[PDB]
Coordinates of C-alpha atoms and ligand atoms in Angstrom, one line a residue:
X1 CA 30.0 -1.5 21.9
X2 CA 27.4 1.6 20.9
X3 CA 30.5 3.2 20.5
X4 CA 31.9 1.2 16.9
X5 CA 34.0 2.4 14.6
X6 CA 33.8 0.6 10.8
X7 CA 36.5 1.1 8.9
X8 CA 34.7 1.0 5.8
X9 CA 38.2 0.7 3.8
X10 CA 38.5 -2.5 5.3
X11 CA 35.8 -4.2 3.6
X12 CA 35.4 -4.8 -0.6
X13 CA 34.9 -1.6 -2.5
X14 CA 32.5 -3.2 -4.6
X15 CA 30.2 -4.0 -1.2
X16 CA 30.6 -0.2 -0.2
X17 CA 28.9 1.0 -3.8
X18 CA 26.4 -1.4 -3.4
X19 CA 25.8 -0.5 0.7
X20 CA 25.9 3.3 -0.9
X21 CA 22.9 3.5 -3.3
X22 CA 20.7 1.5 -0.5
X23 CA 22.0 4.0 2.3
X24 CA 19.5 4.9 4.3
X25 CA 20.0 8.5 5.9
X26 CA 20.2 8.8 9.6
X27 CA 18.4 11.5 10.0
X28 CA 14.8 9.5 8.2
X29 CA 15.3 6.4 10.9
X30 CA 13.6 6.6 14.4
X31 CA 14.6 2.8 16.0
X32 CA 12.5 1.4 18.7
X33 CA 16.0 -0.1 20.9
X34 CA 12.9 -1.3 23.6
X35 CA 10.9 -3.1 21.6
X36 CA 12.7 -6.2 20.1
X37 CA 10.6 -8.0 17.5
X38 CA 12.9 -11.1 16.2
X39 CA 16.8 -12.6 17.2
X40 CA 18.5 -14.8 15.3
X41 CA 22.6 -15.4 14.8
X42 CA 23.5 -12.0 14.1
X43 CA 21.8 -10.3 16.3
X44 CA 18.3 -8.5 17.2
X45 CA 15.1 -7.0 15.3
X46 CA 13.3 -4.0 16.3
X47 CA 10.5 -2.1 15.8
X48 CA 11.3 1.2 13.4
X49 CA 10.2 4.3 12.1
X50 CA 11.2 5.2 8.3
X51 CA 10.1 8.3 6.8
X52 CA 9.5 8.4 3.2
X53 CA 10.7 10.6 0.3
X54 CA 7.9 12.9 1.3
X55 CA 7.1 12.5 4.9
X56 CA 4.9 9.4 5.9
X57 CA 5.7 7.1 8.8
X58 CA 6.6 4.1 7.5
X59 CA 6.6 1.1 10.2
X60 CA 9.5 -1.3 9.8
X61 CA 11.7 -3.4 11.1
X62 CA 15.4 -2.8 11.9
X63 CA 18.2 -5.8 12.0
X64 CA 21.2 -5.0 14.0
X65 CA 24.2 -6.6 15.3
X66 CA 24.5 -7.9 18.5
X67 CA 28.4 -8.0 19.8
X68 CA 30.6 -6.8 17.1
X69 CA 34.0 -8.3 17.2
X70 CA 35.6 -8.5 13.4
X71 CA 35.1 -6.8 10.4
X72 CA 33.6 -10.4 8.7
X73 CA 31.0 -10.2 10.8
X74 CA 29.9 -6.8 9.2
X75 CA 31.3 -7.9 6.1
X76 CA 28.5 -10.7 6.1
X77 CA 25.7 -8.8 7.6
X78 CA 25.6 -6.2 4.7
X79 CA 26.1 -8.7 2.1
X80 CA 22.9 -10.2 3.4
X81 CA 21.4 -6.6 2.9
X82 CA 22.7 -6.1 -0.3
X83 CA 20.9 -10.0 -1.5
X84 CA 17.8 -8.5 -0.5
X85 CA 18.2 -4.8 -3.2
X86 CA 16.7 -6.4 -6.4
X87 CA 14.2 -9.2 -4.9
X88 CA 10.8 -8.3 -6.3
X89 CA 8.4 -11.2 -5.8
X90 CA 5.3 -10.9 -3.3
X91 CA 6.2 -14.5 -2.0
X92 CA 10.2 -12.5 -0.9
X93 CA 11.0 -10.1 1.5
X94 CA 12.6 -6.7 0.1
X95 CA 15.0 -4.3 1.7
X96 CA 14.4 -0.8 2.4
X97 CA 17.5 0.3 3.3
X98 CA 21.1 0.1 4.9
X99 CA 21.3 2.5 7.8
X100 CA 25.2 3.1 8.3
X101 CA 25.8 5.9 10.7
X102 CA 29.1 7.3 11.6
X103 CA 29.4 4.9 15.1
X104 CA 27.5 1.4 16.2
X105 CA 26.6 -1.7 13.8
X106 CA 24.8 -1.2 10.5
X107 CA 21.3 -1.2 10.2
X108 CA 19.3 -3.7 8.0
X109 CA 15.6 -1.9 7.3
X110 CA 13.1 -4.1 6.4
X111 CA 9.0 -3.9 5.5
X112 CA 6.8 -4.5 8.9
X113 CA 5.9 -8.2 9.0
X114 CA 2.2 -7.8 10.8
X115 CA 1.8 -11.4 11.8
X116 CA 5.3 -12.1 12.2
X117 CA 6.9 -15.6 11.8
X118 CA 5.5 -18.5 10.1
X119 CA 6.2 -20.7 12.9
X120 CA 4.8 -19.1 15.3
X121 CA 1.9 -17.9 13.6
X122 CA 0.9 -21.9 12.4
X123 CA 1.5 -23.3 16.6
X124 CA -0.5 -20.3 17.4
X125 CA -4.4 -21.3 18.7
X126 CA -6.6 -18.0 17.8
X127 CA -5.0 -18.5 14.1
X128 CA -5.8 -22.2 13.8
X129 CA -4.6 -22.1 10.4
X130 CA -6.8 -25.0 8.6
X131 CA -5.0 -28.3 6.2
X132 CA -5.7 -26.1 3.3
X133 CA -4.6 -22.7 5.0
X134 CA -1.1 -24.3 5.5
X135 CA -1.0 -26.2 2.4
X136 CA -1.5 -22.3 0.6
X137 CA 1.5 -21.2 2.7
X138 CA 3.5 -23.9 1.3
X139 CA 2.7 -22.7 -2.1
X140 CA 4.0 -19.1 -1.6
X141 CA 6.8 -20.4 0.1
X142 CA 7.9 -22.8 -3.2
X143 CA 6.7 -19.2 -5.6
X144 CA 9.0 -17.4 -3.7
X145 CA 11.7 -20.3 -4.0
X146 CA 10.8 -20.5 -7.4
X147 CA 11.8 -17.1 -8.1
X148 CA 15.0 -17.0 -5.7
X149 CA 16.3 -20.0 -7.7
X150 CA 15.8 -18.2 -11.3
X151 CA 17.8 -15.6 -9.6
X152 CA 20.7 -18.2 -8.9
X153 CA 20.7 -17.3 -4.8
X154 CA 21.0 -20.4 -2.7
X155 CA 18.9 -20.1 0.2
X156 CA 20.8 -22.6 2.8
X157 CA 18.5 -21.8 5.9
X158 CA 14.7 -22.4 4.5
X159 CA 12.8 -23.2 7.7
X160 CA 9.3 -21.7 8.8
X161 CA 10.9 -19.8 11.3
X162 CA 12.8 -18.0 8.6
X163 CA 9.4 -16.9 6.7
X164 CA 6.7 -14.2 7.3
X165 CA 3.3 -12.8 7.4
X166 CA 1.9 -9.7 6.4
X167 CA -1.4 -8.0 6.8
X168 CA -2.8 -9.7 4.0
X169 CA -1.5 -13.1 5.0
X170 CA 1.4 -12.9 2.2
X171 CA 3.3 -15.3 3.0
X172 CA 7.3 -13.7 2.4
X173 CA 11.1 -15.6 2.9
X174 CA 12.2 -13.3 5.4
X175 CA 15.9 -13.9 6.8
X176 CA 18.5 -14.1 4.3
X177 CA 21.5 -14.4 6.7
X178 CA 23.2 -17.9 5.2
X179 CA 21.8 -17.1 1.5
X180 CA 24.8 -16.7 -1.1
X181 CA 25.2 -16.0 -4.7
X182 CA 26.0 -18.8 -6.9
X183 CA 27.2 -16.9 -9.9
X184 CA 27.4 -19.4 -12.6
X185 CA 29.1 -22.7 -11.0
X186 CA 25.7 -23.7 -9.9
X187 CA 26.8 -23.9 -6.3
X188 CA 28.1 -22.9 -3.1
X189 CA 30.2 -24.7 -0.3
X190 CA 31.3 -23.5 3.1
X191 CA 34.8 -21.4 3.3
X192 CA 34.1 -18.8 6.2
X193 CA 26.5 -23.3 13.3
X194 CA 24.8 -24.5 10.4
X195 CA 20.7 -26.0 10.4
X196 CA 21.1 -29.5 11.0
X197 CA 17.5 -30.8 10.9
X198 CA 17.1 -29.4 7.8
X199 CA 19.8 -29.9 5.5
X200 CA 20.0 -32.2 2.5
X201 CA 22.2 -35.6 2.9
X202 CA 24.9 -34.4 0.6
X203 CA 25.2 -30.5 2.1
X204 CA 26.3 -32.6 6.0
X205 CA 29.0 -35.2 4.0
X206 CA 30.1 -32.4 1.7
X207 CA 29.0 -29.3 2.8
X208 CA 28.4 -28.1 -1.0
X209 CA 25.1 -26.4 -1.2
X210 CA 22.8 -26.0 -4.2
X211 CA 18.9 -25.3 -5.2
X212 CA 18.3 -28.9 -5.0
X213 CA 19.4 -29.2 -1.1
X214 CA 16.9 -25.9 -0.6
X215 CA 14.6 -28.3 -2.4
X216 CA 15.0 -30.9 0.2
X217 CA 15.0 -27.8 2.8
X218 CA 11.3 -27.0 1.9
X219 CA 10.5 -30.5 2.0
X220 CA 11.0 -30.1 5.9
X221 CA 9.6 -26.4 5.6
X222 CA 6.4 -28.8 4.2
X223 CA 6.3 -31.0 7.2
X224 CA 6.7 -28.2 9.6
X225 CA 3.7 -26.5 8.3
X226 CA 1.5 -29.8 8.3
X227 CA 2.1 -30.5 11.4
X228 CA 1.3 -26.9 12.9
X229 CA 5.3 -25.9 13.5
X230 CA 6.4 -29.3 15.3
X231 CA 10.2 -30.1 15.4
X232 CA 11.9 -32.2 12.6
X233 CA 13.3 -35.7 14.6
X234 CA 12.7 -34.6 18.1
X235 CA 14.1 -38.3 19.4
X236 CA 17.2 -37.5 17.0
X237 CA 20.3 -36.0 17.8
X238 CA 21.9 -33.0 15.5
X239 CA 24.8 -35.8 15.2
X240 CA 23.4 -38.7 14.4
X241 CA 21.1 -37.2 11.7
X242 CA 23.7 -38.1 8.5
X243 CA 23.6 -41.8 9.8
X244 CA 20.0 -41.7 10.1
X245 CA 19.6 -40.5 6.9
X246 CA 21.8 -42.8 4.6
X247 CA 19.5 -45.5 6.3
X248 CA 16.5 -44.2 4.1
X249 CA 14.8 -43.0 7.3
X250 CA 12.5 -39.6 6.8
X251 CA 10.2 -37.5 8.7
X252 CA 6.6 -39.5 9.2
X253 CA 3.9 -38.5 7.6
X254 CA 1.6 -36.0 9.6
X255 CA -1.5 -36.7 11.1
X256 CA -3.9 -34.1 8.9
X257 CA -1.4 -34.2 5.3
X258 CA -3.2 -35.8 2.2
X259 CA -1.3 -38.2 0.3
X260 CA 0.0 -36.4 -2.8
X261 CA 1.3 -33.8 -0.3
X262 CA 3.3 -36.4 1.7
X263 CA 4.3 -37.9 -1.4
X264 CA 6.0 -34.2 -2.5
X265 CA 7.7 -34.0 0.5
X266 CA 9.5 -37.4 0.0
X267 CA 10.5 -36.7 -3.3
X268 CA 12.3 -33.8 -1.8
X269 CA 14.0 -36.0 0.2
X270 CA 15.3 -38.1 -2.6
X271 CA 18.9 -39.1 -1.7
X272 CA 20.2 -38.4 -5.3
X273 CA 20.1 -34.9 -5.9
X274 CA 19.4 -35.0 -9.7
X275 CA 15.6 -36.9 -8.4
X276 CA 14.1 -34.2 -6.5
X277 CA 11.7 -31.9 -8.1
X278 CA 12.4 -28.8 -9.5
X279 CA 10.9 -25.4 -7.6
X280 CA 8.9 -25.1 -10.5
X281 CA 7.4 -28.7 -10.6
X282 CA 6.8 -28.1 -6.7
X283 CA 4.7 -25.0 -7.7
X284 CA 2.7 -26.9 -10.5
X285 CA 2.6 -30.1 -8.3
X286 CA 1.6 -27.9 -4.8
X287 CA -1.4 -25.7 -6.7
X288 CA -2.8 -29.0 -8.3
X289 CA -3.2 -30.6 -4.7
X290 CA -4.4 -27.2 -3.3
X291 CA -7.0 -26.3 -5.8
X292 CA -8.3 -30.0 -5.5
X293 CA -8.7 -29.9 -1.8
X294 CA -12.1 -28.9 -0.6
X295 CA -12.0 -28.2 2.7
X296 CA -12.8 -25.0 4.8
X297 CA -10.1 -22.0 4.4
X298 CA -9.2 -18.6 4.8
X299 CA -7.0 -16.3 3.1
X300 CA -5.4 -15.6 -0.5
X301 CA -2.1 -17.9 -1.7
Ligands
LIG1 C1 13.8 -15.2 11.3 N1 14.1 -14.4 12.6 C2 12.9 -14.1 13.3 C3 12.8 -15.0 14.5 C4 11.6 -15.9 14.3 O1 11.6 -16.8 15.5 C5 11.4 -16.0 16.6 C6 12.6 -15.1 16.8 O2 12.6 -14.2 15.7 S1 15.4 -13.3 12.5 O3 15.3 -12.4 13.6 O4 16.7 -14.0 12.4 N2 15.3 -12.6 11.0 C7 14.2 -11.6 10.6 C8 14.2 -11.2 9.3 C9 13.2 -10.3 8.9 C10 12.3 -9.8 9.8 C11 11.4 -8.8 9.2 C12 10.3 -8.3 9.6 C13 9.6 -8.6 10.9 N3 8.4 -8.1 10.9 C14 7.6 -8.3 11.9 C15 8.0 -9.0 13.0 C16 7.0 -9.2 14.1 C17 7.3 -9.9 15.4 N4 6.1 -10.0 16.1 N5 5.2 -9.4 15.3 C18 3.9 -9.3 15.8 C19 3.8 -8.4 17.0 C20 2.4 -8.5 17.7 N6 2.1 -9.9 17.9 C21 2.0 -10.7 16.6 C22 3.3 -10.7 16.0 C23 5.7 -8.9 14.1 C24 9.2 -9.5 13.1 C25 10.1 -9.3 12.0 C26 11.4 -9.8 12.2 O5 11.9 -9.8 13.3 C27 12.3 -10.2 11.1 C28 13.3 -11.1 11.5

């Protein structure tokens, strides 16, 4: 399984020019394979080394794939890569590189994430992120949304587990692994284990997926920060959740969330699409209640 050949004339020529200019040399990568840092679908994250044009360590982190069966597999996993080449927003995680040697899975090279997941970080109790801390992280999260969505890239997996922290508490949409191109029909749906709990009413009936289901997506990202990284409908099953949505029921409002913030987060779970705010609007609407809330905080949003 270390032993994988890629035939890279099985996969789209246009993929293979864009993997090519992003192509990270073998020879500049030292990865940590003992020291696993994330998992998700795909695979495992580990700790790297990436030495720059001159010489510098750079710490990073390394995606790989775990058990590689078929060529869609890679096909998907360096499409994610090649999603990530022109992002260039602080509130957005870039890539560094695409690290194909000449046997095992591709490599994915990504910046260092110091404080790692979002999720984690908020449930963690030596951060005790304060109200306005976490509604801050909110805001980079809708800046970064903001941008992704001028860029016509639907997200389709915006959750807090999904998002990162840096040294300077930047808060950065990190996995990109269900995130697709929209082009210029102003949508995607499904063709080729999808996130429930978080998906708009319309993406479960008709699995169509736009910027206005990521809208309803951060709505949820919203509650799970307010509620210090609890999970969405805990006494709801992944199957009933359509029914239990066409019956106007929502996630509660948390125990610590001002009003106006609540009130956002319903709006993003408006049941016609065409309703819910705009990632611009959520910006304007998310740094009016955050300037306007004095209570004690932190760091920079
Ligand atoms: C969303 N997933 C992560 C999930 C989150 O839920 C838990 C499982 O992984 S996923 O693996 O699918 N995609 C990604 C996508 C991008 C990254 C990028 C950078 C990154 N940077 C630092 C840390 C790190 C990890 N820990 N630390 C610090 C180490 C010292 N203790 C404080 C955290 C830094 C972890 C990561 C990652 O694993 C990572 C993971």
């Amino acid at each position: 399984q270390n032993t994988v050949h890629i035939d890279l004339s099985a996969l789209n020529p246009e993929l293979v020019q864009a993997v090519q200019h992003v192509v990270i040399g073998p020879s500049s990568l030292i990865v940590h394979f003992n020291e696993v840092i994330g998992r998700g679908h795909f695979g495992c994250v580990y700790h790297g080394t990436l030495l720059d044009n001159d010489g510098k360590k750079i710490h990073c982190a390394v995606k790989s794939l775990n058990r590689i069966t078929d060529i869609g597999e890679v096909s998907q996993f360096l499409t994610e890569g090649i999603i990530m080449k022109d992002f260039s927003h602080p509130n957005v995680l870039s890539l560094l590189g695409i690290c194909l040697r000449s046997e095992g899975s591709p490599l994915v090279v990504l910046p260092y994430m110091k404080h790692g997941d979002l999720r984690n970080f908020i449930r963690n109790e030596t951060h005790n992120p304060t109200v306005k801390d976490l509604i801050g992280f909110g805001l980079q999260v809708a800046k970064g949304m903001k941008y992704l969505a001028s860029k016509k890239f639907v997200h389709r997996d915006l959750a807090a587990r999904n998002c990162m922290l840096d040294e300077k508490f930047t808060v950065k949409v990190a996995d990109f692994g269900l995130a697709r191109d929209m082009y210029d029909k102003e949508y995607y749906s499904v063709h080729n284990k999808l996130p429930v709990k978080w998906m708009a009413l319309e993406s479960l009936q008709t699995q169509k997926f736009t910027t206005k289901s990521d809208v309803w997506s951060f709505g949820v990202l919203l509650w799970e920060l307010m509620t210090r990284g609890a999970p969405p409908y805990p006494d709801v099953n992944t199957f009933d959740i359509t029914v239990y949505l066409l019956q106007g029921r929502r996630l509660l409002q948390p125990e610590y969330c001002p009003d106006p913030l609540y009130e956002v987060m319903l709006k993003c779970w408006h049941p016609k699409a065409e309703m819910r705010p705009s990632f611009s609007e959520l910006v304007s609407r998310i740094s009016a209640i955050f300037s306007t809330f004095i209570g004690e905080h932190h760091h920079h949003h």
